[PDB]
Design a binder for this molecule. Structure first.
Ligand SMILES: OC[C@@H]1O[C@@H](O)[C@H](O)[C@H]1O
Ligand SMILES: OC[C@@H]1O[C@@H](O)[C@H](O)[C@H]1O
Ligand SMILES: OC[C@@H]1O[C@@H](O)[C@H](O)[C@H]1O
Lengths: 491, 139, 491
């Protein structure tokens, strides 16, 4: 009983926008402070205050876009508190957490330039003013003379920055103001009016979209505000248990494995149904769907502060990431950005740090393996896959194929069963020449296999050779609980 | 304005003329040398009524309320004291007061129903000081 | 410059419900009287009062479903007027048109049995009562004792008939009561409640849907009445000129050719957008979309009564029909019935009669050539086609492929350009064996080529041989202004 797949290598169905592989960093826990920002005089080796070990790993992963500063923090942030001389930045210290605002606009834009990624900034609607947000944009982007542009120059950046992605509030249905969609849509329309295109900059204005299955939100924002947006967001976290006892990152049950993956795959139905509503108001698909919060959310590691959201990261997280990325690919006609929550030390991170030490999570390795899909052409594939899990409720395999700019084909495959391997037969159609293939696979011997600071390489990619290629068929034996990428070269 | 009215912040146009806000776009210069005092003088020289449009789209309720108070109040307050420091001892009279302009478009892309609510809110705080009587105009 | 197509012969995309090839006959002009019903002692040869020449032609075409009695007539009809001793039924005559009610329920049900087609009756909401409609269903379908079933037996039909398709009013936004969607939805819910399933009969209840681009109607009916319907209708006529001067059926300009075809192809946008709204409320596509009025609508033939809607029928009509049917195929995941307006002597008919004489229109020949698509499996095809018309506004070629129950493949092609032939290269993938092909084509030497009673065979199907099949490519040279079907057999 093999899964079967046919790849039509000559039929392109869309472009997988690189920003599908995006990231998110809030001022929360150790995502910004320690995770990225250590300060110029830290003994952790750093580039202008940003730790080198993280920088180098994120560059290798080819981070395309980074969303900052929030999350809920964005609708509480007053950007002027984060610019100017470090010693006059606003300082808050709670003894029950330090926000010293040493990382602000200039440090973020420096971060993005060091990474080679797009900045994606969210302005403050819930507790901010229209002038405040307008002034932020002007500060960043205006090349003339004004109090804001002159301030930016004073603070060390002479020429403006370019920025496309601009979020007009975040989570406005909840921590960003507990707003009705109808009320948010009016604020949105008002705020966005004053966010200008200065110089040769072109803003890509993103309205706050729904939480999970709040389809009414999407309908209202589309019906009332479509002509005034370039994108609409969507938030959906994979939470295995109930809110008050989400379940652990490691040491979990087999039931928790299956439930986690089933909940992750619910993304497909969400994206489908929100997109269907968007199609009614925007049939040409002008407006991007932006899934700017996704990923797993567990109970924090025992003994850690629940407010810091620190969780471990296992092969289970790798499967969530790979299957979710595949869902985004299948919707790349409308989904054009996604941002996993969150970059470092918080929720489903690519990196965890502990002082000067760091590790790469299994989530990191999926992003780094799947980077070959960034800006690739999605190929037409059809499939008939085995089932797995209790009552066959899950697909055993998730597969996606794309063509890179040099003509190579990448086929990525997830085996969602932790107990046995998956046989897959792939037929390749529409090739001219012959092809050869190499592979890499990410797997584990344990259902909760993970990396630690003492053992940072327990779960990492390896060469994959358990396949054969002949007569236009590639037959592969995928390991249990694995993510695999095959690279095909023509000739 | 026009569209400028829902972008203007009136405080930028008062005070020592030399130290007012400057903006320049290469791609147009606004030095704010013509502001509230200069406009009110202009209307007095012409013998015409002044008709000012306050900023709803990017302005705040306090900001508009303070504009009216600055112009018209004859007592002691931070705004009236500031007007006197800026060279006008007694208040001016003004009737015609626009509570935003072009709010369906360049003044905030507002639905009528939403503008009506902001209108009701903003106008509440535009007071009749001394013997002045405002004539409030909705967009 | 060939159009190119690839057929994936092993990939099925859906089932083309046979009812896509449906028809519609209203009590209007000579559609029912003379067109079908001649009376038992007419010198026109007949079977139980229905003319044999039409019967035989419709059976050969494999008519799958016939909608009666309207149109606007349905929301004026009182069915009890059409049952009982034929001689004593209601008579109306307008001098300023005769309705003797000799064709009523028994005659219609007999007609469908003789044809082997499903009956599709529209009940009267606009001027009818809930009891009246409920009694109609009971009269037709109930096998016990009751006043209605006893009456049917007295009128000569002992056992009940079966009927699936039941329209709960027609054109209720216009001639069926000038209703707002919200008000119609409420009447719909009320009327349908009383339409019972008697014996082993199962009704398929159809709500009146939108006229043309009235998307609000579809939204309201889906949101308020989806759980109470099996199907929702849609109406769209191709009208070349303005309402008051639509343009003629023959002797038209080349501009009228292009405008006609462009307007016809607007069906795709309509069906797409109405279907998108349906998907929001019915994501599993339970509810059928029924396009129960479509076709061309011209000024009547000079000197004929405008109220009788008699128009000629040319190769231009054949192209409208073939391109429209192809649009329905591409939407066969949701469109499950369609009904061209109207069957005989009215609008875009398959047959025109003049006393005992009859002719087959070019529209007939499309339906008869495309019957091979009835209940077939739609195959995955992709294409890149030449453009035609002023400014390349039209596709030069429309193509569709399906697989019949015996494994043959039919590929139909329309060439929309009247000026030159169309080269097409078709690649066949996913076959095992070799294949051979035969073809038929329908074309004319004039842009308004048509059949007349004196020359009833000027435009009719002919063998098509101008193609070659080698090395899994079928290259064809389609004639100008043509509709062609290729039949492929494996081995
Ligand atoms: O502050 C914790 C918040 O909870 C979640 O809804 C958000 O993603 C995060 O900003
Ligand atoms: O400012 C440009 C604007 O165009 C028009 O809508 C307004 O009057 C004017 O202020
Ligand atoms: O009856 C005349 C009407 O015109 C169209 O609206 C309807 O199909 C037809 O019944």
């Amino acid at each position: 009983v093999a899964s079967r797949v046919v790849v039509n290598a000559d039929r392109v169905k869309g472009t997988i926008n690189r920003n599908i592989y995006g990231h998110f960093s809030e001022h929360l826990g150790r995502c910004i402070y320690e995770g990225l920002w250590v300060g110029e005089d830290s003994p952790i080796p750093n580039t202008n205050g940003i730790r080198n070990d993280v920088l180098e790993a994120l560059k290798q992963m080819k981070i395309p876009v980074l969303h900052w500063p929030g999350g809920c923090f964005a609708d509480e942030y007053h950007w002027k508190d984060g610019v100017g001389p470090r010693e006059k930045r606003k300082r808050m210290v709670n003894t029950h957490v330090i926000e010293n605002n040493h990382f602000g606009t200039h440090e973020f834009m420096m971060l993005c330039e060091l990474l080679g990624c797009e900045p994606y900034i969210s302005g403050n609607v819930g507790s901010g003013t229209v002038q405040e947000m307008s002034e932020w944009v002007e500060y960043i982007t205006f090349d003339g003379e004004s109090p804001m542009a002159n301030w930016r120059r004073e603070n060390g950046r002479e020429k403006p920055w370019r920025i496309k992605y601009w979020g007009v509030g975040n989570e406005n249905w909840g921590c960003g103001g507990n707003m009705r969609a109808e009320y948010y849509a009016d604020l949105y329309r008002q705020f966005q009016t004053y966010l200008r295109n200065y110089g040769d900059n072109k803003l890509h204005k993103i309205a706050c979209g729904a939480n999970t299955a709040d389809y009414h939100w999407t309908e209202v924002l589309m019906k009332q505000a479509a002509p005034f947006m370039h994108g609409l967001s969507l938030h959906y976290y994979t939470v295995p248990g109930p809110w008050e006892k989400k379940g652990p990152a490691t040491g979990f049950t087999t039931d928790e494995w299956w439930v986690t993956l089933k909940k992750a795959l619910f993304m497909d139905e969400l994206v489908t149904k929100h997109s269907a509503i968007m199609d009614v108001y925007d049939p040409d698909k002008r407006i991007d769907l932006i899934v700017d919060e996704w990923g797993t959310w567990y109970d924090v590691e025992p003994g850690t502060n629940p407010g810091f959201l620190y969780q471990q990261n296992s092969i289970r997280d790798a499967l969530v990431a790979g299957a979710t990325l595949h869902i985004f690919h299948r919707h790349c006609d409308r989904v054009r950005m996604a941002n996993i929550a969150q970059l470092v030390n918080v929720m489903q991170s690519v990196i965890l740090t502990e002082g000067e030490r760091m590790l790469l999570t299994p989530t990191y390795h999926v992003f780094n393996m799947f980077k070959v899909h960034q800006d690739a052409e999605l190929l037409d594939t059809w499939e008939s896959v085995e089932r797995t899990g209790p009552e066959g409720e899950l697909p055993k395999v998730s597969v996606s194929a794309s063509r890179a700019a040099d003509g190579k084909i990448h086929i990525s495959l997830c085996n969602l069963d932790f107990e046995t391997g998956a046989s897959v037969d792939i037929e390749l159609r529409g090739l001219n020449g012959g092809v050869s293939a190499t592979g890499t696979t990410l797997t584990s011997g344990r259902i909760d296999g993970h990396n630690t600071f003492d053992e940072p390489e327990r779960v990492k990619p390896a060469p994959f050779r358990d396949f054969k290629l002949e007569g236009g068929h590639l037959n592969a034996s995928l390991p249990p609980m694995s993510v695999t990428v095959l690279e095909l070269t023509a000739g």
